Amino acid sequence: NRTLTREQVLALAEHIENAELNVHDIGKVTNDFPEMTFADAYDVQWEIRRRKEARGNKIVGLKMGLTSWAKMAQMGVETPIYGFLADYFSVPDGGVVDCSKLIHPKIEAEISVVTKAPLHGPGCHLGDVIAAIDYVIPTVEVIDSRYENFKFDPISVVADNASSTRFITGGRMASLEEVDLRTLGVVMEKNGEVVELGAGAAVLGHPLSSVAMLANLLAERGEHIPAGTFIMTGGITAAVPVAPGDNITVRYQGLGSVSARFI
């Protein structure tokens, strides 16, 4: 279920990462390698991860995209996708994001979890995930597809590490007992104006299901979710463009707010 040569995987990884590192958008890689499979795309993504680790980056978490059944159906995919988060992606709550290091960023409001017990697939589901959750933490992702392309292409997006680039944790942490994730309301404000609303249920119907799907996805490559893993479970809100000068604040029901300043 792979069509790329290893040489092509390595080259695509270098090419795609270079788009991020040099803040230069590129054509979607499936235009040049149309046979690419998801396995190919993850090969590329994990090779990007290796390149980052090899230069000393710590990988500090994972993120989930396509966490909408409607969107999945639209894309003709049966599962979400994931990407990894590098240490330098992290931005503190209220902190600065330098848009000059980004291409055409957008933000999505999410709820993240930190696990306290290992999880694995295949066949992982919500019930398995519950006992493994340490706490939840409001998180805003800055996503920034390295592609010039207007239309979403899941395989190219996976290869591009699911468009990951920054994440801002903030608000207040909470145990599962303290929060109802499905009805957890989120209000995204940009420059003082409410721009998106949504609830945690927008992630698959239940944000913790994302963790289970992640575990099953990882199991496809013989990996799992170690205890202590930070996972951004998926965009609750539609993604919102951000540009220099923008200030955002995302309020989470009972969990305070996450803010960032874009310069």
CB closer to Cl ion out of 101 and 172: 101
**Per the annotation, does 108 bind a ligand?**
yes
Q: Which is nearer to Cl ion, 147 or 252 (CB)?
A: 147
98 or 178: whose CB is closer to Cl ion? 98
Residue 30 or 257: which CB sits closer to Cl ion?
30
CB of 111 to Cl ion, least distance (A): 23
Length of the chain: 263
Structural contact between residues 232 and 100, judged by C-beta atoms closer than 8 angstroms: no
Q: Which helix (H) or strand (E) holds 256?
A: strand 256-262
Smallest separation, CB 87 to Cl ion (Å): 13
**Least distance from C-beta 91 to Cl ion, angstroms?**
7
Residue 110 assigned as binding residue: yes
Alpha-carbon Rg of the chain, whole angstroms?
17
Residue nearest to Cl ion (CB): 98
**116 labelled as ligand-binding?**
no
Q: Report the alpha-carbon distance of residue 103 to residue 163 in Å, rounded.
A: 11
Residue 55 or 151 having the CB closest to Cl ion: 151
Q: Does 63 belong to an annotated binding site?
A: yes
In whole angstroms, give the CA distance from residue 48 to residue 163.
12
Written as one letter, the residue type at 157 is: V
Comparing CA positions, the residue from 178, 169, 203, 192 lying closest to residue 253 is 178
Contact set with Cl ion (CB under 5 A): 97-98, 101, 149-151
Residue type, 212: A
Q: How far is the CB of 98 from Cl ion (least distance, A)?
A: 4
Sign of CA dihedral 232, 159, 241, 53: positive
Nearest approach, Cβ of residue 75 and Cl ion (Å): 14
Q: How far is CA 28 from CA 66, 90, 146, 166, in A?
A: 18, 26, 8, 21
Residue 246 half-sphere exposure toward CB, CA atoms < 13 A: 21
Annotated binding site: 21, 63, 66, 108, 110, 141
Annotated binding site for 2-oxoglutarate: 63, 66
Annotated binding site for Ca(2+): 108, 110, 141
Annotated binding site for Mg(2+): 21, 108, 110, 141
